[model samples]
Target: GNPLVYLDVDANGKPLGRVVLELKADVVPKTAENFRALCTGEKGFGYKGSTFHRVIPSFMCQAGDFTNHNGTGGKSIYGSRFPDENFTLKHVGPGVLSMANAGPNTNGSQFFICTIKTDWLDGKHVVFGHVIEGMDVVKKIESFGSKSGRTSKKIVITDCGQLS
Candidate 1:
């Protein structure tokens, strides 16, 4: 079964709501576990207090940079960087959760939740999960995005952890 994780979001100082993710553990075990442990904070590092540094209304919201809280820095539980677990999963449609990487084999803590079908990313980015709930919260966050992928206001992850 897929594992569920939650991200409590806030913009500026107000609470937006929680976004639930269903990780595709069955398809990609290693990548799924990486995200799961990060959500549980068992690794002493996680998505808590992090911000969605990059956002695009018709695209996706990128986050999970627990290290720098911006798009530039993050690390995997495996190490500072990890290889691309697999490209078995495809960016099928909206609400898809995929790994954020600089290039090939550079997956870290950063990830993106799609707001629309981003099919061009197929085989290039690892699709590990999907937003199972509170997609409206993601849309509201997307409202703050700009043409250049800059967020109008700080979209912060107030708290995050595994649901069970």
Candidate 2:
């Protein structure tokens, strides 16, 4: 079976819902394992208290910045950053989870989930996983976003772990 993980989200201290993701381990083993380990938090530092700092409606919701809780800070299990595993997968539609980076080989803990078909991001981002359930929760997060990708309130990942 594929690696499944979930994020229990809260908005401005209120519970929103859970967003489940299915990592394409078979397609992107390194990227998938990176996300899985982050969820499990065996590394001592992970995304448990992280915030979804950026949300662009009809685009994607971004998160995994455990350090700053904004768009600027995060680290990978590998190190501060890691190379893009590959671009085998495509940003075909909504629920697509892809790594967020500053540039090439800059992937870290930060990632995003597509709210609509964003084929333009196909090769620029490393597509590692997709939402298996609770896309409604993602939409709720999207509702908190502005056109500039800023959220009116803090959208946080209250808890996260592998589904086993």
Winner by lDDT = 2
**72 Cα displacement, candidate 1 (Å):** 1.2
- TM-score each candidate: 0.97, 0.97
* Candidate 2 local lDDT, 3-76, one digit each (tens): 99999999999999999999999999988999999998999989898899999999999999999887898998
Q: What is the lDDT of candidate 2?
A: 0.93
Residue 75, model 2, lDDT: 90
**Alpha carbon lDDT of each predicted model:** 0.92, 0.93
Local lDDT at 10 for model 2? 94
Clashes (backbone N, CA, C under 3 Å), per candidate, total 0, 0
Deviating ranges (above 4 Å) for candidate 2? none
Q: Which stretches of candidate 1 lie over 4 Å from their true place?
A: none
Q: Give the TM-score of candidate 2.
A: 0.97
